[PDB]
């Protein structure tokens, strides 16, 4: 259905990560760029099925502080909640 790709080596802040997500998941122009905004988008906006390919995960953690893991966790809970999300970590 929908495919999203994060090139983790290009993520230089948590702003980059959220803005990459906004484009890749076709999020609203009001996207709040926060953990609560992403859960809501994942469970009340995003088209499914959804394949998220997150490459260079380790590098994306360097300049996002705790953000890369937090974001990942939101998708995993969304998936645990029933959302049809495939996650590919490379």
């Amino acid at each position: 259905m929908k495919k999203a790709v994060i090139n983790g080596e290009q993520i230089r802040s948590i702003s980059d990560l959220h803005q990459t997500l906004k484009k890749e998941l076709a999020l609203p122009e009001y996207y709040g760029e926060n953990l609560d905004a992403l859960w809501d988008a994942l469970t009340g906006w995003v088209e499914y099925p959804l394949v998220l390919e997150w490459r260079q995960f380790e590098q994306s953690k360097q300049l996002t502080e705790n953000g890369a893991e937090s974001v990942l966790q939101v998708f995993r809970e969304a998936k645990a909640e029933g959302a049809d999300i495939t996650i590919i970590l490379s």
Binding site: P28, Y30, Y31, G32, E33, N34, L35, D36, A37, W39, D40, T43, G44, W45, V46, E47, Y48, S70, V74, G82
Partner: protein, 110 residues
Amino acid sequence: AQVINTFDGVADYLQTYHKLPDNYITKSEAQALGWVASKGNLADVAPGKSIGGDIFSNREGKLPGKSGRTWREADINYTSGFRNSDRILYSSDWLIYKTTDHYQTFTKIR
């Protein structure tokens, strides 16, 4: 009854009756009636309803936490089409907040 979906209207209804007004349905309920977020067909499958009632995990920790307190959220100003960025947030001990900027910032309203 007539739809109640404004900050004050829902806020007062939650404090007084300790429940959301009758025009609210959870994401799961909506999905069982045929709601497809990406289609934005909520008013087609559930006329006069809005998404509201699900647990709010307060992931950014911006709302005040307490042992025993859980939060819930509900859409405000919604009528039809794609969802907006207005929400009402209410706790198990009836604290009431809102957000109009897709959970960036929150204002305490009760």
